[PDB]
Design an enzyme around this catalytic site. Structure first.
Site, PDB file in Angstrom:
ATOM      1  CB  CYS A 112       8.082  99.534  93.069  1.00 46.16           C
ATOM      2  SG  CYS A 112       7.781  97.786  93.354  1.00 46.16           S
ATOM      3  NE  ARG A 115      11.422 100.958  95.266  1.00 44.01           N
ATOM      4  CZ  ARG A 115      11.906 102.162  95.541  1.00 44.01           C
ATOM      5  NH1 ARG A 115      13.075 102.502  95.005  1.00 44.01           N
ATOM      6  NH2 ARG A 115      11.235 103.027  96.330  1.00 44.01           N
ATOM      7  CD1 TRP A 284       3.718  89.292  95.906  1.00 41.24           C
ATOM      8  CD2 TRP A 284       5.277  88.133  94.813  1.00 41.24           C
ATOM      9  NE1 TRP A 284       4.874  89.353  96.644  1.00 41.24           N
ATOM     10  CE2 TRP A 284       5.849  88.648  95.995  1.00 41.24           C
ATOM     11  CE3 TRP A 284       6.071  87.364  93.962  1.00 41.24           C
ATOM     12  CZ2 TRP A 284       7.180  88.411  96.350  1.00 41.24           C
ATOM     13  CZ3 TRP A 284       7.396  87.135  94.313  1.00 41.24           C
ATOM     14  CH2 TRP A 284       7.934  87.648  95.500  1.00 41.24           C
ATOM     15  CD  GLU A 289      -1.033  96.197  93.830  1.00 39.36           C
ATOM     16  OE1 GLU A 289      -0.646  96.721  92.758  1.00 39.36           O
ATOM     17  OE2 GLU A 289      -0.540  95.138  94.293  1.00 39.36           O
TER      18      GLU A 289
HETATM   19  C1  HEM Z   1       7.153  91.158  93.125  1.00 41.46           C
HETATM   20  C2  HEM Z   1       6.357  91.843  93.958  1.00 41.46           C
HETATM   21  C3  HEM Z   1       5.901  93.298  93.689  1.00 41.46           C
HETATM   22  C4  HEM Z   1       5.131  93.990  94.512  1.00 41.46           C
HETATM   23  C5  HEM Z   1       4.537  93.522  95.860  1.00 41.46           C
HETATM   24  C6  HEM Z   1       4.889  95.287  93.938  1.00 41.46           C
HETATM   25  C7  HEM Z   1       4.128  96.255  94.530  1.00 41.46           C
HETATM   26  C8  HEM Z   1       3.793  97.403  93.883  1.00 41.46           C
HETATM   27  C9  HEM Z   1       2.667  98.247  94.184  1.00 41.46           C
HETATM   28  C10 HEM Z   1       1.646  97.978  95.311  1.00 41.46           C
HETATM   29  C11 HEM Z   1       2.716  99.274  93.334  1.00 41.46           C
HETATM   30  C12 HEM Z   1       1.702 100.425  93.236  1.00 41.46           C
HETATM   31  C13 HEM Z   1       0.598  99.770  92.404  1.00 41.46           C
HETATM   32  C14 HEM Z   1      -0.470 100.708  91.924  1.00 41.46           C
HETATM   33  O1  HEM Z   1      -1.026 101.465  92.772  1.00 41.46           O
HETATM   34  O2  HEM Z   1      -0.763 100.644  90.702  1.00 41.46           O
HETATM   35  C15 HEM Z   1       3.861  99.089  92.454  1.00 41.46           C
HETATM   36  C16 HEM Z   1       4.254  99.915  91.434  1.00 41.46           C
HETATM   37  C17 HEM Z   1       5.307  99.700  90.571  1.00 41.46           C
HETATM   38  N1  HEM Z   1       6.092  98.560  90.509  1.00 41.46           N
HETATM   39 FE1  HEM Z   1       6.087  97.135  91.868  1.00 41.46          FE
HETATM   40  N2  HEM Z   1       5.555  95.394  92.739  1.00 41.46           N
HETATM   41  C18 HEM Z   1       6.187  94.155  92.544  1.00 41.46           C
HETATM   42  C19 HEM Z   1       6.928  93.802  91.434  1.00 41.46           C
HETATM   43  C20 HEM Z   1       7.454  94.672  90.515  1.00 41.46           C
HETATM   44  C21 HEM Z   1       8.374  94.309  89.449  1.00 41.46           C
HETATM   45  C22 HEM Z   1       8.841  92.834  89.179  1.00 41.46           C
HETATM   46  C23 HEM Z   1       8.669  95.454  88.809  1.00 41.46           C
HETATM   47  C24 HEM Z   1       9.593  95.706  87.613  1.00 41.46           C
HETATM   48  C25 HEM Z   1      10.407  94.750  87.148  1.00 41.46           C
HETATM   49  C26 HEM Z   1       7.944  96.539  89.445  1.00 41.46           C
HETATM   50  C27 HEM Z   1       7.981  97.879  89.102  1.00 41.46           C
HETATM   51  C28 HEM Z   1       7.028  98.780  89.510  1.00 41.46           C
HETATM   52  C29 HEM Z   1       6.807 100.096  88.955  1.00 41.46           C
HETATM   53  C30 HEM Z   1       7.601 100.769  87.819  1.00 41.46           C
HETATM   54  C31 HEM Z   1       5.789 100.650  89.588  1.00 41.46           C
HETATM   55  C32 HEM Z   1       5.237 102.065  89.291  1.00 41.46           C
HETATM   56  C33 HEM Z   1       4.109 101.950  88.269  1.00 41.46           C
HETATM   57  C34 HEM Z   1       3.386 103.255  87.979  1.00 41.46           C
HETATM   58  O3  HEM Z   1       3.880 104.396  88.304  1.00 41.46           O
HETATM   59  O4  HEM Z   1       2.280 103.126  87.373  1.00 41.46           O
HETATM   60  N3  HEM Z   1       7.227  96.018  90.486  1.00 41.46           N
HETATM   61  N4  HEM Z   1       4.496  97.935  92.829  1.00 41.46           N
HETATM   62  C1  LIG Z   2       4.837  94.285  88.161  1.00 42.99           C
HETATM   63  O1  LIG Z   2       4.625  93.992  89.536  1.00 42.99           O
HETATM   64  C2  LIG Z   2       3.503  94.474  90.144  1.00 42.99           C
HETATM   65  C3  LIG Z   2       3.112  93.960  91.368  1.00 42.99           C
HETATM   66  C4  LIG Z   2       1.976  94.456  91.986  1.00 42.99           C
HETATM   67  N1  LIG Z   2       1.582  93.958  93.175  1.00 42.99           N
HETATM   68  N2  LIG Z   2       1.267  95.433  91.393  1.00 42.99           N
HETATM   69  C5  LIG Z   2       1.633  95.959  90.202  1.00 42.99           C
HETATM   70  C6  LIG Z   2       0.779  97.038  89.575  1.00 42.99           C
HETATM   71  C7  LIG Z   2      -0.007  96.295  88.503  1.00 42.99           C
HETATM   72  C8  LIG Z   2      -1.363  96.874  88.159  1.00 42.99           C
HETATM   73  C9  LIG Z   2      -1.677  98.224  88.312  1.00 42.99           C
HETATM   74  C10 LIG Z   2      -2.951  98.687  87.960  1.00 42.99           C
HETATM   75  C11 LIG Z   2      -3.349 100.144  88.127  1.00 42.99           C
HETATM   76  C12 LIG Z   2      -2.747 101.071  87.072  1.00 42.99           C
HETATM   77  N3  LIG Z   2      -3.099 102.478  87.380  1.00 42.99           N
HETATM   78  C13 LIG Z   2      -2.427 103.398  86.445  1.00 42.99           C
HETATM   79  C14 LIG Z   2      -4.552 102.680  87.280  1.00 42.99           C
HETATM   80  C15 LIG Z   2      -3.894  97.787  87.477  1.00 42.99           C
HETATM   81  C16 LIG Z   2      -3.573  96.442  87.321  1.00 42.99           C
HETATM   82  F1  LIG Z   2      -4.472  95.561  86.845  1.00 42.99           F
HETATM   83  C17 LIG Z   2      -2.314  95.996  87.663  1.00 42.99           C
HETATM   84  F2  LIG Z   2      -2.019  94.692  87.507  1.00 42.99           F
HETATM   85  C18 LIG Z   2       2.764  95.485  89.546  1.00 42.99           C
END
Ligand code: HEM
Ligand SMILES: COc1cc(N)nc(CCc2cc(CCN(C)C)cc(F)c2F)c1
Ligand code: HEM
Ligand SMILES: COc1cc(N)nc(CCc2cc(CCN(C)C)cc(F)c2F)c1
Ligand SMILES: C[C@H](O)[C@H](O)[C@H]1CNc2nc(N)[nH]c(=O)c2N1
Ligand SMILES: C[C@H](O)[C@H](O)[C@H]1CNc2nc(N)[nH]c(=O)c2N1
Ligand SMILES: [Zn+2]
Lengths: 414, 413
Positions: A112, A115, A284, A289
């Protein structure tokens, strides 16, 4: 013991001691690195013998975080947990402990980039839920709270923990809000190609599809191991942005929109050896993405040819870089559109800068920050974001979010 | 488990890797921490350490020519066994030198261009004894490899390390680089990455023309003696002026770059022997120039200047003015090289080629070690096919390794 990382752009070196507290398999060995593999490789339940050490280690770290390690409350809590595990084969988290655990799983999410916000997380305790109707109500309150008329707020809703594996709570949707995809008889795909399978599950469960390009899928909610149930999210709670371009008046004629709220609902929250199989969490969006992956992946909406076409770009050879030129204009539109509608979004430069700042602070105050480079670096213009040139160490800290089987592969229907 | 699978998340193709069972040296990772993004994880081998290293490679060679356990294989094992006893080390037959060189390229986890691995032109320079002789060899390499713009891949292999005090070393990191000059007002003229090397060349007697794109002299070290300076004859150094196919003002940037990318600071391991001077060259992928050389903040850093001429809103990062000027810079680099009939490959063609190669390698060899962090281009990542390609990374021999800078380790004369 004392591991080093370097930023090749700034020559700054950081020192990682937090890696001594790492745990479950990277998947890597001394002979093979699997750092670009997406996933690793039912009965799955922990025993009393497995749970005592895991709970203790979590409780120990909780009390250390609140500056009460060794306190009477600390010792009594361990005893309370140890006894509860011995007589019931599990234990319940206190509310404070659940909030702490949720926030640290986000803090520990190697993949993420967001963070920097990890401590500002709204935790909704839904462990009193017993039914899919109950779950639906909780989830609607989550969506509305997080959306906040476009001033988005991070949040998570935690459903009851796994017990004997046979009464799981699951959200079958991978994200709370996604668009349907319908595969046609002629091979084409209407809507979002990534969701054709889940769309068919919904239709089978009785969903009546409007068969459009941007249809918000119903929720499919499973409580205490029972068959999952369909619910329509109320449309007034689903905020959307129409996508237009600041310079190209014709961009809006593309008819594009996206939803404002990204909400992962298919993962598993592990806290002190307990498993929360249903824990939808939301933040958000980073612009890329949607603008890079959702619109331009060849297996997605796949609009580069249509956008390039409108830009009158020479598409004869790839060395014209017409894909690169159109990708940029799409991601300009997506940021401009969210920003115009006062819906929270962050571009990939601002987001990577803040993550470097977050990473350096974590090293200073906490002694490390696990980060998956493959995932942190944005899917366009990588080397001009600061994280491209940043060496990163990857290891699993607990509490952590984990992947889990897709429920339709596992469920035993009745 | 004796099999490992990889999946492509765009095409859903799965490939099965079995070649990893032959991996060797460290990756740096463990089951507790993955270092996939760390750039680098007398002192030479004893007698016990060398025999098995040479042993595996000879087996590998004869197994590769349909002749495992066969005729010459047997007494060549004995012959290499014989020589290590007397000479402490041993010497490769020409065929073996050619084999391991092409296989170190084949085994180069970080190289996107390996579809060409067997079309390597190998120059055996193991009769060299002096920097003058090194310079002659390198000139002939440069002239062969450039080939008037129709570039050809080549390697020149110099004498192997023996004791460590008599290494052969090319001190330049690449054979052709531009100089870097610190300025009285803290700034920097030319390529900033080369300030230290440039100052050594000055301290060695090089008279600096003190412009941007001054080709550096070769600094050649033979038999462990002090290195010496040589000016590559300019008619051997092919350079391309950078213009834009749309923007007239582009050529007014005064930009140019060289045609021949030649890595000269790595070490070649074959059968436990250490070839410390082994300059090798190929041809450019366009993003190496347009994205990294020109737009790294720690390099030529022209983004701000190009965006000005494009009159882009440079206040907020969310206009993506950087992303826009980057695309344009890379259109022109490719367009310029192509117009001058100098070989170059864009990141789309290159990555599609590497997917073909990976397909081939799993098909005919059972594995193709690859470093996702390096294979993925530094711009437009996810719209190339290798973004969505799972890759296993592991170390196969023969291989190219890094080694320390000689000016940190050289006891001068
Ligand atoms: C609030 C602003 C946040 C931003 C800008 C953000 C940004 C991102 C992005 C760009 C990714 C990669 C997305 C992808 O390629 O699918 C990601 C993955 C992830 N985020 Fe964050 N995220 C946010 C909030 C959160 C929150 C609130 C949580 C948990 C409470 C979280 C937990 C994770 C996890 C576990 C992943 C890995 C998911 C995976 O391996 O499929 N994120 N985040
Ligand atoms: C929880 O906080 C987050 C903040 C931001 N910016 N992005 C995410 C990933 C959320 C997210 C990820 C994916 C791709 C999944 N792959 C396994 C294909 C599709 C989504 F429609 C979506 F919504 C989470
Ligand atoms: C023929 C066309 C070739 C192309 C298009 C090509 C492309 C590339 C690129 C883009 C890189 C990344 C380097 C960087 O970004 O700094 C790379 C790395 C590398 N290439 Fe190739 N290459 C070619 C030929 C060769 C040859 C002939 C050899 C050796 C015989 C070779 C061996 C390597 C090695 C060892 C690396 C890793 C360098 C390092 O770790 O610093 N390549 N290649
Ligand atoms: C052997 O064939 C090749 C073909 C292609 N395309 N590229 C290379 C590496 C080319 C190359 C790489 C670097 C490394 C710069 N950072 C590590 C600081 C500097 C160069 F000056 C140079 F030229 C080799
Ligand atoms: C931090 C990271 O290891 C480092 O910046 C790498 C990333 N990927 C790269 N990829 C290539 N092709 N060349 C590089 O120099 C780098 N640098
Ligand atoms: C094979 C590779 O792991 C896969 O394509 C990854 C690459 N990096 C990624 N990075 C992010 N942020 N999101 C992704 O889905 C992926 N996909
Ligand atoms: Zn690894």
């Amino acid at each position: 013991r004392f591991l080093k990382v370097k930023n090749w752009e700034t020559e700054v070196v950081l020192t990682d001691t937090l890696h001594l507290k790492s745990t479950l398999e990277t998947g890597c060995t001394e002979y093979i690195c699997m750092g670009s593999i997406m996933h690793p490789s039912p009965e799955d339940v922990a025993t009393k013998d497995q749970l005592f050490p895991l709970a203790k280690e979590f409780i120990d770290q909780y009390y250390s975080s609140i500056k009460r390690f060794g306190s009477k409350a600390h010792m009594e809590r361990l005893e309370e947990v140890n006894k509860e595990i011995d007589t019931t084969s599990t234990y319940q988290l206190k509310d404070t402990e659940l909030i702490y655990g949720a926030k640290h799983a986000w803090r520990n999410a190697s993949r993420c980039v967001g963070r920097i916000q990890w401590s500002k997380l709204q935790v909704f305790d839904a462990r009193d839920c017993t039914t899919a109707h109950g779950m639906f109500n909780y989830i609607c309150n989550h969506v509305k709270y997080a959306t906040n008329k476009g001033n988005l707020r991070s949040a998570i809703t935690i459903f009851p923990q796994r017990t004997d594996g046979k009464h799981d709570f699951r959200v079958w949707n991978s994200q709370l809000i996604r668009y349907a995809g319908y595969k046609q008889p002629d091979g084409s795909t209407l809507g979002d190609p990534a969701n054709v399978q889940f769309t068919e599950i919904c239709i089978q469960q009785g969903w009546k599809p409007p068969r459009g390009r941007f249809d918000v899928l119903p929720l499919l909610l499973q409580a205490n191991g029972n068959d999952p149930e369909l619910f329509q999210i109320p449309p007034e709670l689903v905020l959307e942005v129409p996508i237009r371009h600041p310079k190209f008046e014709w961009f809006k004629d593309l008819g594009l929109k996206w939803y404002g709220l990204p909400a992962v609902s298919n993962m598993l929250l592990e806290i002190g050896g307990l498993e929360f199989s249903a824990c939808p969490f939301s933040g958000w969006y980073m612009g890329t993405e949607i603008g890079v992956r959702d619109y331009c992946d060849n297996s997605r909406y796949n609009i580069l040819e249509e956008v390039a076409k409108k830009m009158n770009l020479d598409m004869r050879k790839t060395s014209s870089l017409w894909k690169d030129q159109a990708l940029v204009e799409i991601n300009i539109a997506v940021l401009y559109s969210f920003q115009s509608d006062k819906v929270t979004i962050v571009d990939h430069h601002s987001a990577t800068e803040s993550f470097i700042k977050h990473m350096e602070n974590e090293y200073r105050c906490r002694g490390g920050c696990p980060a998956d480079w493959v995932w942190i670096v944005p899917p366009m213009s990588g080397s001009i974001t600061p994280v491209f040139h940043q060496e990163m160490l990857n290891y699993r800290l607990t509490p952590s979010f984990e992947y889990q089987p897709d429920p339709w592969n596992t469920h035993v229907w009745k």
